Amino acid sequence: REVDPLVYNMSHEDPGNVSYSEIGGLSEQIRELREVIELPLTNPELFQRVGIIPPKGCLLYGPPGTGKTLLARAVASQLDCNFLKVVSSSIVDKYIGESARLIREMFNYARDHQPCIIFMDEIDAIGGRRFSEGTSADREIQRTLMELLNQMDGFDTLHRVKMIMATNRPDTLDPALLRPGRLDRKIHIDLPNEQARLDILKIHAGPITKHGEIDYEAIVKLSDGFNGADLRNVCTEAGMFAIRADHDFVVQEDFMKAVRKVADSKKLESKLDYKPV
Amino acid sequence: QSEQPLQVARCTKIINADSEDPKYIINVKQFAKFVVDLSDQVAPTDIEEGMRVGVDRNKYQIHIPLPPKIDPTVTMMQVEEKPDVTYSDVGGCKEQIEKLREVVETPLLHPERFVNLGIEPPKGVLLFGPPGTGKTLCARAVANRTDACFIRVIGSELVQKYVGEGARMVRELFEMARTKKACLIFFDEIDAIGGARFDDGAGGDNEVQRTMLELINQLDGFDPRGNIKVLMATNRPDTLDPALMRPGRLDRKIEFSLPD
Amino acid sequence: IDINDVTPNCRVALRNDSYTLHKILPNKVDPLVSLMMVEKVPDSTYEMIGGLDKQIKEIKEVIELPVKHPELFEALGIAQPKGVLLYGPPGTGKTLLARAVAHHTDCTFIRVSGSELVQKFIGEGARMVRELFVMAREHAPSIIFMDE
Amino acid sequence: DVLPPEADSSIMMLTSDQKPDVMYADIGGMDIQKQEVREAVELPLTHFELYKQIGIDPPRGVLMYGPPGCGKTMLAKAVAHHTTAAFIRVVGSEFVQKYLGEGPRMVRDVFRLAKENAPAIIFIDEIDAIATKRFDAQTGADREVQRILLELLNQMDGFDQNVNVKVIMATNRADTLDPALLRPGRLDRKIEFPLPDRRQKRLIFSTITSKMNLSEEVDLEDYVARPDKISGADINSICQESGMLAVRENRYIVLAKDFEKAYKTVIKKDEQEHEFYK
Amino acid sequence: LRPGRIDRKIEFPPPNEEARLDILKIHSRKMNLTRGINLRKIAELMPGASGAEVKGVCTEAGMYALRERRVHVTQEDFEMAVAKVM
Amino acid sequence: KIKENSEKIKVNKTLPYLVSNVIELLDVGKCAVIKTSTRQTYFLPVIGLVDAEKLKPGDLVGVNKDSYLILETLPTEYDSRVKAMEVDERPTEQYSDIGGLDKQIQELVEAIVLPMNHKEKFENLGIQPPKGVLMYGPPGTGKTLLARACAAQTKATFLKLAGPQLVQMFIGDGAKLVRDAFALAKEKAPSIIFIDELDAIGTKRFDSEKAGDREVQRTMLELLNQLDGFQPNTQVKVIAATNRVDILDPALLRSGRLDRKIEFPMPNEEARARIMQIHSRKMNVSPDVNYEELARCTDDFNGAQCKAVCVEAGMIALRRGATELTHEDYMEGILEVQAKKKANLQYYA
Amino acid sequence: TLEEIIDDNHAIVSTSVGSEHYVSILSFVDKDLLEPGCSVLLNHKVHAVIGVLMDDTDPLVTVMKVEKAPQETYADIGGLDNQIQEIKESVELPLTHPEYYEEMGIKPPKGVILYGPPGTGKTLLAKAVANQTSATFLRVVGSELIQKYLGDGPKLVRELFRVAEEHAPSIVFIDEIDAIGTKRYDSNSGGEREIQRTMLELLNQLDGFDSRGDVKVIMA
Numbered sequence A: 001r002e003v004d005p006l007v008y009n010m011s012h013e014d015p016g017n018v019s020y021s022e023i024g025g026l027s028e029q030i031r032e033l034r035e036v037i038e039l040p041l042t043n044p045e046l047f048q049r050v051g052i053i054p055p056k057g058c059l060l061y062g063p064p065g066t067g068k069t070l071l072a073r074a075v076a077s078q079l080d081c082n083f084l085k086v087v088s089s090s091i092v093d094k095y096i097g098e099s100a101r102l103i104r105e106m107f108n109y110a111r112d113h114q115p116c117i118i119f120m121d122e123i124d125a126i127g128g129r130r131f132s133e134g135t136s137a138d139r140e141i142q143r144t145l146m147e148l149l150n151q152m153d154g155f156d157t158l159h160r161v162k163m164i165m166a167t168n169r170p171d172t173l174d175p176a177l178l179r180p181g182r183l184d185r186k187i188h189i190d191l192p193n194e195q196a197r198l199d200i201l202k203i204h205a206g207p208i209t210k211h212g213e214i215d216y217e218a219i220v221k222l223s224d225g226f227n228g229a230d231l232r233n234v235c236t237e238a239g240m241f242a243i244r245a246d247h248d249f250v251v252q253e254d255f256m257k258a259v260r261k262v263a264d265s266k267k268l269e270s271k272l273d274y275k276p277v
Numbered sequence B: 001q002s003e004q005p006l007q008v009a010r011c012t013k014i015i016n017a018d019s020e021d022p023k024y025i026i027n028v029k030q031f032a033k034f035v036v037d038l039s040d041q042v043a044p045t046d047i048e049e050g051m052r053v054g055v056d057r058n059k060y061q062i063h064i065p066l067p068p069k070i071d072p073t074v075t076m077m078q079v080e081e082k083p084d085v086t087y088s089d090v091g092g093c094k095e096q097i098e099k100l101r102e103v104v105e106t107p108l109l110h111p112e113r114f115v116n117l118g119i120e121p122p123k124g125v126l127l128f129g130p131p132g133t134g135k136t137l138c139a140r141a142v143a144n145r146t147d148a149c150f151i152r153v154i155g156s157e158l159v160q161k162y163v164g165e166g167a168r169m170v171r172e173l174f175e176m177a178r179t180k181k182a183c184l185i186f187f188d189e190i191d192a193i194g195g196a197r198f199d200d201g202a203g204g205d206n207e208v209q210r211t212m213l214e215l216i217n218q219l220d221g222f223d224p225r226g227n228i229k230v231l232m233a234t235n236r237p238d239t240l241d242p243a244l245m246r247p248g249r250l251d252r253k254i255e256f257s258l259p260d
Numbered sequence C: 001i002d003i004n005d006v007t008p009n010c011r012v013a014l015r016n017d018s019y020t021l022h023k024i025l026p027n028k029v030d031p032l033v034s035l036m037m038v039e040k041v042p043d044s045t046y047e048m049i050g051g052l053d054k055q056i057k058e059i060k061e062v063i064e065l066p067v068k069h070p071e072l073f074e075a076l077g078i079a080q081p082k083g084v085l086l087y088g089p090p091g092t093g094k095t096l097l098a099r100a101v102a103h104h105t106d107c108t109f110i111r112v113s114g115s116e117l118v119q120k121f122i123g124e125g126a127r128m129v130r131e132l133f134v135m136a137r138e139h140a141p142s143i144i145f146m147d148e
Numbered sequence D: 001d002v003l004p005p006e007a008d009s010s011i012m013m014l015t016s017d018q019k020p021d022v023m024y025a026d027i028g029g030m031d032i033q034k035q036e037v038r039e040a041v042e043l044p045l046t047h048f049e050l051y052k053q054i055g056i057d058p059p060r061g062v063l064m065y066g067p068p069g070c071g072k073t074m075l076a077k078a079v080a081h082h083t084t085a086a087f088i089r090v091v092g093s094e095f096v097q098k099y100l101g102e103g104p105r106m107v108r109d110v111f112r113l114a115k116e117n118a119p120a121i122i123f124i125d126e127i128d129a130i131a132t133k134r135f136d137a138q139t140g141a142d143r144e145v146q147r148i149l150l151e152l153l154n155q156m157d158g159f160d161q162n163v164n165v166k167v168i169m170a171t172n173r174a175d176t177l178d179p180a181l182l183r184p185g186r187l188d189r190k191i192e193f194p195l196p197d198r199r200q201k202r203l204i205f206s207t208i209t210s211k212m213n214l215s216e217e218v219d220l221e222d223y224v225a226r227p228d229k230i231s232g233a234d235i236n237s238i239c240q241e242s243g244m245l246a247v248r249e250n251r252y253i254v255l256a257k258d259f260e261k262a263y264k265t266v267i268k269k270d271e272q273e274h275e276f277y278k
Numbered sequence E: 001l002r003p004g005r006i007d008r009k010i011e012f013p014p015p016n017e018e019a020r021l022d023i024l025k026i027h028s029r030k031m032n033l034t035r036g037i038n039l040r041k042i043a044e045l046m047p048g049a050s051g052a053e054v055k056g057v058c059t060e061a062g063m064y065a066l067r068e069r070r071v072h073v074t075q076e077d078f079e080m081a082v083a084k085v086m
Numbered sequence F: 001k002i003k004e005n006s007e008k009i010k011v012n013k014t015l016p017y018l019v020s021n022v023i024e025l026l027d028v029g030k031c032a033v034i035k036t037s038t039r040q041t042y043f044l045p046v047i048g049l050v051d052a053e054k055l056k057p058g059d060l061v062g063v064n065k066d067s068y069l070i071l072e073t074l075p076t077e078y079d080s081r082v083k084a085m086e087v088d089e090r091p092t093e094q095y096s097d098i099g100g101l102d103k104q105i106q107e108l109v110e111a112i113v114l115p116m117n118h119k120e121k122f123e124n125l126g127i128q129p130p131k132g133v134l135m136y137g138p139p140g141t142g143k144t145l146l147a148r149a150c151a152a153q154t155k156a157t158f159l160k161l162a163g164p165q166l167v168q169m170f171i172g173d174g175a176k177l178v179r180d181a182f183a184l185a186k187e188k189a190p191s192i193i194f195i196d197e198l199d200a201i202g203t204k205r206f207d208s209e210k211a212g213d214r215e216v217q218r219t220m221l222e223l224l225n226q227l228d229g230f231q232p233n234t235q236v237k238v239i240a241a242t243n244r245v246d247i248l249d250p251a252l253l254r255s256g257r258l259d260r261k262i263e264f265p266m267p268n269e270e271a272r273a274r275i276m277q278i279h280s281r282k283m284n285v286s287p288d289v290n291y292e293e294l295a296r297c298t299d300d301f302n303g304a305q306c307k308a309v310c311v312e313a314g315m316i317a318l319r320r321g322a323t324e325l326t327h328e329d330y331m332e333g334i335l336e337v338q339a340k341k342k343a344n345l346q347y348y349a
Numbered sequence G: 001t002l003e004e005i006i007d008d009n010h011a012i013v014s015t016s017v018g019s020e021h022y023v024s025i026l027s028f029v030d031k032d033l034l035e036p037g038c039s040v041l042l043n044h045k046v047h048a049v050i051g052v053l054m055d056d057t058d059p060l061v062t063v064m065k066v067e068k069a070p071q072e073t074y075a076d077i078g079g080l081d082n083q084i085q086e087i088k089e090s091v092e093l094p095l096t097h098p099e100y101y102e103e104m105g106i107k108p109p110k111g112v113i114l115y116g117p118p119g120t121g122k123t124l125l126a127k128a129v130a131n132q133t134s135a136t137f138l139r140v141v142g143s144e145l146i147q148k149y150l151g152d153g154p155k156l157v158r159e160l161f162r163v164a165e166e167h168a169p170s171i172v173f174i175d176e177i178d179a180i181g182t183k184r185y186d187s188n189s190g191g192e193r194e195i196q197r198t199m200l201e202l203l204n205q206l207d208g209f210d211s212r213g214d215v216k217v218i219m220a
């Protein structure tokens, strides 16, 4: 059976070497994702004994920059079973039926290599709501979506093939896609809380050569409403202040300036609390 | 029996562009892509990596460089027959005529008086006023009196059914104007596509705002706009985008107020 | 082949090399026939209809008489009626009676619904709904039926 | 030459292995839908003589419309498992092919295969992938979809009585279907698959939990008797998450604690419903 | 509604009792009706129903005769069909 | 017989080739499953004249027309639209040509240039350089002008995308454009990518039950993933520019995609005077010009408006014909650039 | 199709399959009536431009043109004496006696609006003018101008007025022009603003840059 060059590179993309130690506030979410992915594919008889078929689909949904793609990269790097990387917008092709054919080939490759995971980043590129008055392009993309839905939970059952789908606009997804049978477990990668912000800030300031006493608690207190990428940018801006001052290190004054700068930058955002259903 | 037909392709890449025997990747539209070489009558420098290569059949090599593609809709916009209206048929707007004449004609007639003082003449005008004041009349007078390529465009002619088709033809219009040495473009009824961008919540006017933004970027962006001078005729100069009204794109706003 | 027999919208065989019309094949399915086959309005008759006899009488007048007897109206001195509208809740016999009267009068019953699935049959570049009138005139007498 | 009418791209299911493992016992509830699908697809395939003798005209096409997760494809799987007639499954999205003419060819092939293997049941999942009502000639993809849909209509119209081929179609969004596909005639009947009532929730809970090993303290009645509009897929998700929690705690018996946590984790639709409107 | 276009406006109200009886007779002509069925009684039992509903009643009476494996549609089948449809 | 073998090989390898792909590379001894631009899939029992272990699924190859045997490996495909939007003839605008923007320059220059030239600072401080620089500004100011100055003074691979260039029909296009642009920037040496008029592509997503801007949303999503997604691209820097960030999607403004969200202000009095001088340096300027007076008169002239003041002052001089401005031609230019509609308000006290 | 003309004896012709052959144009063709978008006859083997086409008109042209004289006449109208006089002065008189206008030194009115309550003889005078006039009568409606896809409304307006010029002298009668306004339809993708752009296209066609030929506009 043919393997498309697309599906080949999908399988062979390098997820860096991200470890679970590089993810902060996400501990419950990490273990839910691992529950869905790893354990059913390593000890598939515990769930048989309990009398269930383990969940198949995960929806990592949350505000931008909360760590969905980082978590997906960590899973891809730290698990062994076959893995298929794909951005849902890089499946779309202008030819007739080409996108649906590509999705069919994705699932055919997954079934051929039985223990497999399929990660679709920013699924709302394809899995958007279906229009009752859309254009021809919208109808083609909806054909692609419905091919995907049939592949997940259509007539032919899926065995040992798991789905992960990352999004930050889950409200726009098709209800058939968000259905419990297709995307079984919808986990919310929410904005870091106090302890999550502390953990992320420590993670991203560990390699920075600090030469003072760092009230990470004060930085976290001023980082209310931030995301993980915002905290990484806080570290980067503290470093920027260091270079601009011509210093080969960082201090708490720099960190405070950086966090206030990022807080000011946050004023240009919009609604972020988007939920499914 | 002597001029063989040539299928039009596009030179995608020039493998080994050095003096060594090069190879050109052509893409015969909707037919196929090939690696080919030049005819011995065609100089290497005559062909770039984006020109319409124009290759023959049968070992696709007999080259003829060929100009950029222009949509028939866009190319059927040059004013071939000049309007029968003159500047003497417009009355009561002497100062408006003087300003519009300056901007559109005088640089295109006596450029020496401008390069002597080192001035960049204003390149962009917005004739705005109530319904019926001499806006289209003055546009027709300019078209009649001008010795240059006059391209009329109607705001409603940039509304097209497929996403990116309005901006596509804006790009084609401006690049055709660029190919021509001295061009006046005239967007009449510019209210159609030129409107202030509003977020809304249902994505209304996204396509018209995209084509307007393409026009904005073509008027003043990361590129020398060329020797193109633009007219914007409107009777609702309150919807036009602030970016469109910026004096980097509409330098010489003229008001066709009701005559005294 | 007499060129007078190659009237537009007819299938014809063309020789492989140097295309040359050398036979008039059986005519393609009429676009109206295809459109009505797609719409699939069930055939009806007055005997299938029951319970609306005064309504049968009125529709009979206004549809049958103008096309069969266009002399009663001329003698009366009134323009032939050309528009009928049928009030009534769903499934009370409006389409049934329209189809029955068309069938009995022998008028070609053209069901207009606005579906884009039949727009190629009406006309490929159908930017106007009046383009059905060429078909209606060709298959006249015609009854164009709309349903809300 | 003329080939045997078995040339086709859409092959029947090899009932030896491709047959689904679902059953009318595994479904549970939805007896109205089960009976309607029976009388539409299964009875006329072994009693068409009785139909003709009592004066009924058997239908071809049932359309199984309804919300997502209510049991359309599951009932299709059960019908495929139990039926003793040929079964040709296909997805509406599979009929759209790059090669122009393929897809009308595929529709012809599926219907020819069904006719030559009669009694047969065709099953098109997500019919609204090709049965949409808005078509934009001048786009190519929609022209091909129009050709596919018209070929499908022609095939179903060309099935006179005495032919044992029953069409079944599935769609979450039936409002977007073209009315012609549903047109009174030998084109379609309609069955609804709505969100189950409270007693249907009870039946689905019972059937899904019969396969698990619950502790005697569960009392699924408390969960059944709640004011939530949740599908059979939602009930399966609730039971599945309860089992997942039991596995997490390393137990092989599911507890009321597990079911409580699973229900609160799965049915999280609670939001808004402002109290001043009532 | 301008009084110059719709040359005639006909009204198809919901069928009367007699109209419902006529519709029921027409739509039952096409089934095995056991001798002596009170189609008038069925029409009376189904008031305020359209011809489509009458046809559905006939079809469901046939379906009930099918469910009780039998060759002739009967009064009981018509009664149950009316009850189910309405 | 090396000579004659090479002669036969060259005879078979004469142009023109048909360019195909290497979609699959099977082992049976290695064989190819190439797909050729005539849209034809041919299985090659013998790969051909190119090394088998140099071909990977999807790469572009040259093939004999008739034998369909791979003859060469060709460079990667970049839409002639993504190659035509690369800067070859560099702009010429020193930072001195910029007016009231000094902090904004410093910020951009830092975030873009410094990680390119002085990466050692970042490495020794243990920092990740800032990724994206978004230049908000009112319809005026110096966003595109600063982009031009950066492209002129950077000496790197500059790729000017513009917004409405990436919005196409033929679903998949636009996303392909963005992918090709970022891939070209990646293959080239250190490179900047300038998104002119970002709001054309980055408009916020919405939920709609009847219709929506789904294709542009998909292209924006591809851009989002390219900026900060599964595959880190730390060698291609991105500077976007826009007039309305209230339009842009939140996922496009997040840190990691566009972290230095610079804001270009209305020029102050000194900034306006400096812009006047910058655009009057090349004219025949009179020695009595109170540029501070002109700046005070400007009063919220934002961007070009000052250049337009200078140009229209030159035009006003040109009416008479002279070598002078005498801060009356500039006064008239300010008057005619204010664009105040004519009125007969001379009855005011 | 003829995509573009490069010079005499050369042109780019798009074959039905999409190929874009750059080919010579022989002396046979008039080197006239050739504008981008036109149909062209191409030699099968060499694809040389050897003829032109479009001798047929489009279904839109056929439907718009009134290839008939309505039986109603000015004598069949009673009471609209002044309205008949003015509409005649606008549409018929300049066609039957251009000498009056040419000697007076004025151009006739370009358009006329027939405005009145629901039923007063507006379309009746349109019918009478069509019956008596020697110009080609093109009838359109406002709801008939309201199109479905974005850009179809303006395209239809442009096509209608181009047909009017091609068949000039012509009278373009737009009945119920307020239908482009008052009525709202879901088929219209763009909606109110696409309606506005269609109206703007009508504005340009009625009085815009392009010089009109002999096309008198009646609008009810």
Ligand SMILES: Nc1ncnc2c1ncn2[C@@H]1O[C@H](COP(=O)(O)OP(=O)(O)OP(=O)(O)O)[C@@H](O)[C@H]1O
Binding pocket: A022, A023, A024, A025, A026, A062, A063, A064, A065, A066, A067, A068, A069, A070, A071, A166, A167, A168, A189, A200, A203, A227, A228, A229, A232, F228, F229, F251, F254, F256
């Ligand atoms: N929980 C976290 N712990 C550590 N780093 C985080 C976390 N969340 C985000 N980041 C940082 O954010 C950047 C990557 O974010 P990521 O791509 O995972 O976001 P996302 O949630 O998928 O958002 P988007 O909706 O924009 O795609 C990296 O800098 C990563 O370090």
Ligand SMILES: Nc1ncnc2c1ncn2[C@@H]1O[C@H](COP(=O)(O)OP(=O)(O)OP(=O)(O)O)[C@@H](O)[C@H]1O
Binding pocket: B089, B090, B091, B092, B093, B129, B130, B131, B132, B133, B134, B135, B136, B137, B138, B233, B234, B235, G203, G207, G208
């Ligand atoms: N100032 C003027 N001098 C002479 N004729 C004029 C003048 N203004 C209008 N006209 C007459 O009116 C017509 C010109 O109007 P024009 O088409 O230019 O209007 P416009 O200002 O562009 O309005 P619209 O908003 O309706 O497009 C011609 O008939 C011309 O004779």
Ligand SMILES: Nc1ncnc2c1ncn2[C@@H]1O[C@H](COP(=O)(O)OP(=O)(O)OP(=O)(O)O)[C@@H](O)[C@H]1O
Binding pocket: A153, A154, A176, A179, A181, D026, D027, D028, D029, D030, D067, D068, D069, D070, D071, D072, D073, D074, D075, D170, D171, D172, D193, D204, D207, D208, D231, D232, D233, D234, D236
């Ligand atoms: N009535 C039911 N009884 C038991 N389980 C059910 C029932 N309905 C649905 N399910 C469960 O839901 C899943 C089956 O969903 P199915 O594919 O039948 O949905 P559908 O109604 O066709 O919807 P869609 O088209 O949105 O996928 C399986 O988990 C099945 O266990």
Ligand SMILES: Nc1ncnc2c1ncn2[C@@H]1O[C@H](COP(=O)(O)OP(=O)(O)OP(=O)(O)O)[C@@H](O)[C@H]1O
Binding pocket: B220, B221, B243, B246, B248, F097, F098, F099, F100, F101, F137, F138, F139, F140, F141, F142, F143, F144, F145, F146, F241, F242, F243, F267, F275, F278, F302, F303, F304, F307
């Ligand atoms: N601070 C400044 N110093 C010098 N020239 C300036 C300045 N601000 C604007 N300009 C002038 O503005 C014109 C170009 O403006 P530019 O393209 O930079 O605007 P922008 O910020 O991209 O805005 P937009 O595209 O919304 O109109 C040039 O004349 C440039 O000289």
Ligand SMILES: Nc1ncnc2c1ncn2[C@@H]1O[C@H](COP(=O)(O)OP(=O)(O)O)[C@@H](O)[C@H]1O
Binding pocket: C048, C049, C050, C051, C052, C088, C089, C090, C091, C092, C093, C094, C095, C096, C097, E023, E026, E050, E051, E052, E053, E055
């Ligand atoms: N007056 C009637 N007599 C007999 N049958 C009727 C009558 N009215 C409706 N029907 C039946 O109802 C069904 C649907 O009627 P239909 O023609 O759709 O009515 P409408 O056009 O008002 O919806 C038809 O199958 C028809 O047999």
Ligand SMILES: Nc1ncnc2c1ncn2[C@@H]1O[C@H](COP(=O)(O)OP(=O)(O)O)[C@@H](O)[C@H]1O
Binding pocket: E004, G076, G077, G078, G079, G080, G116, G117, G118, G119, G120, G121, G122, G123, G124, G125, G220
């Ligand atoms: N003198 C008249 N005044 C008004 N209506 C008349 C006159 N003579 C005839 N009619 C009738 O009026 C109808 C035309 O009305 P019309 O002008 O179309 O009204 P509207 O256009 O406002 O709907 C025709 O059916 C015609 O027979």
Ligand SMILES: [Mg+2]
Binding pocket: A068, A069, A070, A121, A166, F228, F229
């Ligand atoms: Mg992500």
Ligand SMILES: [Mg+2]
Binding pocket: B135, B136, B188, B189, B233, G207, G208, G209
């Ligand atoms: Mg005008």
Ligand SMILES: [Mg+2]
Binding pocket: A153, A154, D072, D073, D074, D170
């Ligand atoms: Mg299903």
Ligand SMILES: [Mg+2]
Binding pocket: B220, B221, F143, F144, F196, F197, F241
């Ligand atoms: Mg700019």
Ligand SMILES: [Mg+2]
Binding pocket: G122, G123, G175, G220
């Ligand atoms: Mg009228």
